[PDB]
């Protein structure tokens, strides 16, 4: 492949083998229950 | 930038300030050709941005001096020539810059920027107690009502005034009765009734709300981030320090260390 076009999260463990791009939507962790 | 950054005075009768704090003598250097010496007053330095300045050079080992601009407050070029933070940094006049600064694309093509450490936007500040729908109701973008609700703030020569006056042309029209000095006069205008709404940053807006007396409120907080951006260090175009501190950065935000300095610096009761 050349390229990513995906939900892809940004962290240490990928910065030093993948050089990204600014991000385009900030998110963050949550749960999921039922209700 | 009053919670990111806080300059104040030295000891009584020491000079060597409060341990936990940065030495920082600002340039007031405003002439040169006929003038001997601005006294450079030993002033320090202490915040968010200075703590996270103190994590980087524990990190990735390198030595620094701070010293404050005074020409302009960020940056907006006057036909071509910049000034502030991002002029110094054009100008090789100092290697990194840091503090308030926010990211775009008519800064970013001139300087190099980190991953964002900070998150931010544009919101704006109501007076007290939902009125306004954001940046599409149309008071604010036909400003041609009986009653006319006027004057958003917008500090001059800032960013959001860029992107008002590139994209709206109709609001920058209108938009002229501002205030003429930071978020601490344009709060107390409107608290006295000067003007009933603040169009400005996201994260200043919103520590501003969390400390005060009872509280104002901004409109709908988790959708009054509009174009959203984010801070960075500013650094010269293409030098090696940009792989190692990005790269350090991250680690902070993977660490919780940059977690804790939110409860401890950015808190408020409201
Ligand atoms: C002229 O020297 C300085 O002024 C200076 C610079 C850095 C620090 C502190 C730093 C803090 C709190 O600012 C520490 O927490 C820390 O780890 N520092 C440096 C550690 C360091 C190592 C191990 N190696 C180095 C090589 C060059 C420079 C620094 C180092 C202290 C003083």
């Known amino acids: 492949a050349d390229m990513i076009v995906a939900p892809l999260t940004i962290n240490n463990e990928r910065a030093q083998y993948i050089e990204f791009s600014k991000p385009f939507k900030y998110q963050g962790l949550t749960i999921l229950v039922k209700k | 930038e009053r919670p990111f950054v806080i300059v104040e ?23 040169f050709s006929s003038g001997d010496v601005a006294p450079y007053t030993k002033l320090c330095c202490k915040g968010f941005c200075i703590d996270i300045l103190k994590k980087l050079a524990r990190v990735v080992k390198f030595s620094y001096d701070l ?118 006069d344009a709060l107390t205008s409107l608290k006295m009734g000067k ?24 409109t709908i907080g988790s959708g009054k981030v509009f174009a959203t951006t984010g801070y960075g260090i500013a650094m010269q175009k293409d030098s090696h320090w940009k792989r190692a501190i990005d790269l350090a950065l991250l680690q902070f935000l993977g660490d919780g260390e940059t977690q804790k300095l939110e409860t401890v610096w950015l808190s408020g009761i409201c």
């Open chain 2, 9 to 31: 005075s030295p000891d009584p009768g020491t000079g060597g300030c409060v341990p936990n704090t940065v030495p920082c003598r600002r340039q007031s250097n405003h002439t």
């Open chain 2, 67 to 184: 010293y404050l601009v005074t020409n302009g407050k960020h940056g907006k070029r006057v036909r071509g020539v910049w000034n502030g933070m991002i002029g110094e940094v054009y100008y090789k006049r100092a290697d990194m810059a840091i503090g308030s600064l926010t990211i775009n694309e008519e800064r970013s093509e001139i300087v190099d920027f980190s991953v964002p450490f900070v998150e931010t936007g544009i919101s704006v500040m109501v007076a007290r107690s939902d009125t306004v729908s954001g940046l599409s109701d149309k008071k604010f973008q036909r400003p041609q009502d009986q009653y006319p609700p006027f004057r958003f703030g917008t500090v001059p020569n800032g960013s959001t005034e860029r992107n008002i006056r590139s994209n709206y042309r109709d609001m920058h029209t209108h938009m002229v009765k501002f205030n003429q000095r930071s978020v601490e």
């Open chain 2, 195 to 218: 003007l009933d709404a603040f169009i400005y940053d996201a994260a200043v807006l919103n520590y501003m709300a969390g400390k005060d007396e009872g509280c104002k409120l901004v």
